[PDB]
Design an enzyme around this catalytic site. Sequence first.
Site, mmCIF file in Angstrom:
data_model
loop_
_atom_site.group_PDB
_atom_site.id
_atom_site.type_symbol
_atom_site.label_atom_id
_atom_site.label_comp_id
_atom_site.label_asym_id
_atom_site.label_seq_id
_atom_site.Cartn_x
_atom_site.Cartn_y
_atom_site.Cartn_z
ATOM 1 N N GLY G 30 6.475 -43.739 28.806
ATOM 2 C CA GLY G 30 7.265 -42.976 29.751
ATOM 3 C C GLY G 30 8.418 -42.208 29.139
ATOM 4 N N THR G 31 9.105 -41.444 29.988
ATOM 5 C CA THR G 31 10.267 -40.641 29.610
ATOM 6 C C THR G 31 11.372 -41.528 29.039
ATOM 7 O OG1 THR G 31 10.269 -38.568 30.876
ATOM 8 C CG2 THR G 31 12.331 -39.838 30.815
ATOM 9 N N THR G 32 12.242 -40.946 28.231
ATOM 10 C CA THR G 32 13.323 -41.731 27.667
ATOM 11 C C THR G 32 14.531 -41.719 28.618
ATOM 12 O OG1 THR G 32 14.902 -41.819 25.796
ATOM 13 C CG2 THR G 32 13.825 -39.705 26.232
#
Lengths: 244, 241, 233, 198, 102, 243, 244, 250, 242
Positions: G30-32
């Site tokens: 996933g996104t950071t």
Amino acid sequence: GSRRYDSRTTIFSPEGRLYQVEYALESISHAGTAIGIMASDGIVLAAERKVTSTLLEQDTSTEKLYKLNDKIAVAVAGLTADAEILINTARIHAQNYLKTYNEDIPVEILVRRLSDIKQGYTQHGGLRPFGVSFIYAGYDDRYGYQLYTSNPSGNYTGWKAISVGANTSAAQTLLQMDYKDDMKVDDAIELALKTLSKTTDSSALTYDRLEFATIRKGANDGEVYQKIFKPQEIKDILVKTGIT
Amino acid sequence: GYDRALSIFSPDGHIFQVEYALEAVKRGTCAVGVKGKNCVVLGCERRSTLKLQDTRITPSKVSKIDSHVVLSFSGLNADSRILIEKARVEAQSHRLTLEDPVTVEYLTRYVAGVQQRYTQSGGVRPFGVSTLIAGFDPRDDEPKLYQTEPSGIYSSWSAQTIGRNSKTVREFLEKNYDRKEPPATVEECVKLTVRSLLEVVQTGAKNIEITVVKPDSDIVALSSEEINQYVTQIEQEKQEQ
Amino acid sequence: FRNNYDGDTVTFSPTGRLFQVEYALEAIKQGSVTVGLRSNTHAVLVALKRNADELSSYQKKIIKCDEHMGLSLAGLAPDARVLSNYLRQQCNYSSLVFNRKLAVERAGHLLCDKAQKNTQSYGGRPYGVGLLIIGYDKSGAHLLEFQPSGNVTELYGTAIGARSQGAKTYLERTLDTFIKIDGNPDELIKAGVEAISQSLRDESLTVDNLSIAIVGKDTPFTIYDGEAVAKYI
Amino acid sequence: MDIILGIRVQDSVILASSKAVTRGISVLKDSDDKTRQLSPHTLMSFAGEAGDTVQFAEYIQANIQLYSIREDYELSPQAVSSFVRQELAKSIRSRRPYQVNVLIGGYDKKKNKPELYQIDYLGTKVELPYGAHGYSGFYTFSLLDHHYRPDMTTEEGLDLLKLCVQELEKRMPMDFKGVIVKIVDKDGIRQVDDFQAQ
Amino acid sequence: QFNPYGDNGGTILGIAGEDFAVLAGDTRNITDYSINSRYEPKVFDCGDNIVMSANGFAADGDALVKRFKNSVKWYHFDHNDKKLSINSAARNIQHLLYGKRF
Amino acid sequence: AGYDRHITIFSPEGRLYQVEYAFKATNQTNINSLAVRGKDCTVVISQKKVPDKLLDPTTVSYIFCISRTIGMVVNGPIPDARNAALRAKAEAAEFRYKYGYDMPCDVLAKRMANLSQIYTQRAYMRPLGVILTFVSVDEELGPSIYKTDPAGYYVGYKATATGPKQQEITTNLENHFKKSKIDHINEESWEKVVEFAITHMIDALGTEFSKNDLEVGVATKDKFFTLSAENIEERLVAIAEQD
Amino acid sequence: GTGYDLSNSVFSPDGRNFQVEYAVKAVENGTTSIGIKCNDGVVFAVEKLITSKLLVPQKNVKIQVVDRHIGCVYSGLIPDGRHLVNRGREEAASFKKLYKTPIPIPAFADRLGQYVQAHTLYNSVRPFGVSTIFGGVDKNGAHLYMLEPSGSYWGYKGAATGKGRQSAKAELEKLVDHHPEGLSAREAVKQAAKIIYLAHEDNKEKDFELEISWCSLSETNGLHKFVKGDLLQEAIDFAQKEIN
Amino acid sequence: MTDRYSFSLTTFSPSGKLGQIDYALTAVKQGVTSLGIKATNGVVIATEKKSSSPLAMSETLSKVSLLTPDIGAVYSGMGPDYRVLVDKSRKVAHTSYKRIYGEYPPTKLLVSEVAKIMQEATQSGGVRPFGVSLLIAGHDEFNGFSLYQVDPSGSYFPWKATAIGKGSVAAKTFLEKRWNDELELEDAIHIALLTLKESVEGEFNGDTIELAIIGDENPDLLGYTGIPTDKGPRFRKLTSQEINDRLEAL
Amino acid sequence: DRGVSTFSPEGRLFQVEYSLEAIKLGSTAIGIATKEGVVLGVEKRATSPLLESDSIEKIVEIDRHIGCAMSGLTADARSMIEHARTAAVTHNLYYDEDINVESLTQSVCDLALRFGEGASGEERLMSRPFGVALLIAGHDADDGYQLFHAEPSGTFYRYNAKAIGSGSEGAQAELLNEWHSSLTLKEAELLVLKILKQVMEEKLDENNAQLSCITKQDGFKIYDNEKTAELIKELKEKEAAE
């Protein structure tokens, strides 16, 4: 989730057989033999105690003959634990019938109920069947002395003479050989002990390996009597019949 | 608790548990029913795998649901009991609410539904039973005969048989039963039934029970002799040729 | 591999994927293309209806959820009925209890959470349908894209279904233009029909084959079918 | 209340039950049969609350018939009555109890003897030579206490009723519109169609 | 003890013409001898050319109208904005009311 | 057939693999702990390893205060550790409410052991991968140490150790007792019992400790508390001026 | 044997739970997103990938508030993330309703932890596919937390999870060293925007949108609020500058 | 969540065996030896306290448990299973008997109750059988002294003497020789200690052995006086000291 | 095994797909709609000469203006019909009007997906999908004569003509060409009767086939043998005519 570990105890085989019922029977086939012989003036129940010892207390012991009613009793072949569960519900059923109608429960009515309970564990619930087979010996004023049999499947049938447990094929053959409609209780008592004596896997048929019961109409009264023999009573009958 | 879907579809659109249920029926003792012009007769064979029973008490194969309707079956015995009970119960209920006993078709439709229901409900397997239900509707003399199976399907027949070797006895019946003219007599109707069973029972007057149902709750089961007699008069018919 | 981790939604694949959800997600791609786009005054839905025979009808693709909200589906028709009905109740509840029009952004959050429930609990299956939701609320015109994974997104426009990438590129290209078609519905709809046609292949859009819906400022959400959409073909 | 009488003679039980059905100010019917046959040799008469009365009777009937079919046998009168008492006994502690009183007359084909059972809505059961529910008792119990013999014939019995019914038409405040009589014996149940002048 | 009911007064009237109909009501809402409002609408347009007024206990009256209007809304959803005939509305109102028979 | 290794049912050898694997998880933290009994106090020492620089060291612990008197140190993953702690706290509060007196260390241990026993028999519940050491100065039994495992087993100890090097700590302690001949540390102050505890931890593990390498809990008559980095340091300096 | 990774609550031979580990994989993908604990509050920031020009800018807010003083941001399966927050809101609501005081961050952390740990106890459920950074200001100052699919969580000075969690952790660790005396909410906001920009390299493919929120005793009065307008652009600039 | 395991975990194999029960029995075999001996005026039950660590305090753990004041139990197999079984057993003696009749249940019946509990864990959904076998020894007025054995299957049987666990085969044989229907309690206690010795590897003293008996009534152990018909519990657990004094005349 | 509500990698529900297979094995059923009414025809298919063919009910009445034909595991349709009739009658009780043919259909379809072993959406209790399809035919004031095809999938379509069952693909192919928007009821009857003859293994007579129609004037009626037989004849002649 769970589905992965579900044995699915209630399904048909491609042949249309109930696996568990079959296997339960397979289990019963290794249980101490039990025989029920019905005569004109009474019924006889005989069972061979599986697993015995010098130390095993026998006066206190019971593992095959249970009194359900005052006029009904059963001989067990299979898992004792499973049998007790059923036996107790049976004793309750009889008492309920009595409370509702003020009349002792007719033998077949009690048998159909127990058989129905079993039948259930066969069609729903995802549980295993009871690994038990019963020989019912009872009396009522509608069919007199009766002898029934029920097994894991939930089916029951009437008999003149029948065996359940181990070596039934052998036992059945021998009974089919010497049973006669006009038999008398003591006649039946002997035929019973003889059959066991011939099918026994043991060396000799000693009393310490037997359980015996008779439902006879004690003439000096006019009523029916249930009697589960005690160690010595079995030891005696064992000598008379000629097995000493 | 337990609700596993035991009866489901497989790639080819089959429901094996239901089909396997039929296999249990095929293995059951034979049962047959033929309707005359004023009666219906039901016949069933008695296995012989073991013989030393007590026929007095051993539950027979033809059961009364009400006084004017009976039901016979082929398949698992334990299962048939549950269906017979439900049917008898529904019978009394219908009388109580509609103030009129069930028609043979209604009773049949009921039983069929119970069977169907057990083919699409979680946690249960189909009934390893197939039935023949017959009798006369209240105040009607037109004989009724129906058959139900594990799937829940049913329909009426002039004559039909289920159980082992039913294929055979059906043949016999298809080339021995004329709809144009049904067995005008209780006697000739009961004969045809025994004949059809003899094709598979292989001589067994003690292995063949009959039950005759007539209009207005007139139901009676014949004795070994009454039956044994039909067996006799029939075996001669053959020899006389 | 995969075969051991796609038997249900309560199982993660060794790489963190949820195949049952992914398979569900596939049912959408196999469905008929539908487009959604919006200016500052209106939001429009255009969908290609599909039929079975020529003796059959064209399955409806657009459903009204309230006077100010509606959607178009791609995938399992039943599921769209289920979800849209749930969206109707939420709209209804917001009105009855608070005398408030359900905000499109909120409707989206609700759908997401409802979908998510059938992806973490044994026995349930994900929904096999994609939804494009348009509506006009207190913050204006809106367009949402709902996926069975539970991911709901607000966009200026988009498309889902077979050959959908066609229209999506067109819109992604036309953006600066249509997002300004304010106070002119017929123009937004035309832009919508031009977008969807970029996903055609088999045939061309006919009258009992095209479906369009619109909602806006003083425009209660309304669907157009048949001759009603003729003026756009 | 309604007239529910029962008298057990030598080889049969006779049940008499008023035919009137009154609702407030008007008598709505004069041919009502306040009875239900539970089995070929068991008859039950009843009186009580407007709805419960029949609902309970038919309920009992259904069950006894079901038992008959299932067992292909006819429960003794004693057993039937014990079942009925259990049912009323349950009812008395239920949310809404059946307000019904009954007389059960049956012929025990086994013992070959007629039997009469009286049971009120509380589940009170007693077996008697003769019995009655409601006010009727207050008049008949001493009539029979007087002119009653164990070995009486069915004919003598019917005459004994005629005696009772007369006293009731003389002293009871209401017009119960006569009774319907029924005899239960070794041959079953039959109605005395000619009692309106017997 | 708690009394779940009240009386807000009011009076309504309905008359049918050959091609029209009217439903009228005063706009006064009261409680005992006090006036709650000199103008509190009591007759409503529920759509499909149906006008209704449930007079008596305001809480209940409003609840009913609300419930019926909602019924109309779903009638459209379920039957393609199909108009709810007046006779059909009436049968529906009956079920709404009898539903709370006790 | 080969599923007798995924759920708590018997294997042909009459074993419960899932329970064995649960024990394996208890060492995941790679931390050891030991408990000893003073003359009238109980002490539990546990290693503390917070290598990440982004962590707030103060929020890292495997020691819990179940009640004013009961303290619990856990060997195993923190999430199961916390699941266990919470339950024990609830079990302790409830017991006091119903029976009118503070739940005893051994009783709480028994109750938790039973709970663990169930996960051992019921198929839908998995055992918790943790070993619980409960300590206190029971009002009836004095200094007390009771530990429970994923097997539902438990018993009282004179002293005990748990973790990857449990054996080293154990035999070390066994020795000290074979020597003293008494079942406890004959020391009046807990500070000295804490020091004894840390000293032997060092001997058995052959490692030196700084104030941030340990975690210490002390149980006295009517109170169980944990030490601060400084309370520790002071105690560490003490052992230093003995060697 | 094998297959210890098909059911959730199952222990592998070496004591692990693969289903949970596989969840982590969804998280890492996933996104950071991050969290920085300043000296009187906390700052939350996250990477929003511009999958297309079609996404309305600023319109798909990721960071969520619980009650009025707590902030939550997560990486992984967004829907799972929302689900956990809904639970958090319920839990916070339940707590306040009985104790009156809004839920202390440490108490809230365990509420989420016990709940998540619960989803690793049965095979009838799937573990959470998200790691969550959350915190706020309470009676005892600021608290920053990160919760893993295993149900594990601890207090952090700085925290990061997702695709660029390494870049972030590197950057966060640096800050910690260059600010032993604490950081201000204003400074954390700037620094945060930067850390997000750097960590965007491991995903430099698609263009992104930055999102920051904070809860500071002196800047927001203990309440959680989103950083927008001038302060936001200002942080974007500070980041866009040092990224060059 | 919600236990979806509503199906049996113990089923019939094609051979007719019930695996889980067999396996459970296996677990019992691996267990530490325990035995029982019935005398003419008492019964004795004993086992070895296999302390699993020199730091553990074996007294804090009892394998011999009092069920009612005249009934005790001992086992072989899984200690934790036994423990919960003892609690259930003590409770059932109350809820299913004492609370109905105002008197403690007679041995056979309580045993019958325990047995049932085990039978159920053999058929109920989502569970495994108990991995233990018990030896219940008690006394009731109309049945005198008795000794019972309960297996994971739910089966039970009465014994004059018997042993279960590790060295059961060997122990049983040593008992068949020494037993007779004239033993006095002290004799059985002696035979007991001798039988147990063989099965014990290292230390054998009042601290590594656990033994209790069912014998005379112990008014001294009642706790109160004033009620004639209440004469004291028949169950008594020997003390470390009492055990050693005996080992001296062993 | 695998959940009864699992998706295939292609995005389909296995049980539903398999369900469709069992239906392909069903006895043919055809429906044709004309501005004069809708005709429903079905293949009896007795599995024996002893089976009283008229006890074969594969065309039932939902309401006076709605009737329907089935194909597949027919026993599965009993509860569907019950539901349908109940829905129809109920709408009349609550709204004092007839149920729209389409709504009636939608109602039946809503039961369709109500299966599973615990699907997170409500309480879907039914262990498997239905194994039967339906051709619902009726008329209402809103959309006149209508013909609907409803499947175990929960979806339904409106057709001018539709054939389901064993000979469907082939018969549908014919219908595609045969059907035209000006057909008369009479023409439709022969057309159905004809196509049934082509796909039936059996020699189509008035005993192994059954006709029925729905007209605004007389509602749903099931043609009695005598009536159908004469239509059979009327067909042989017209065919043998060219």
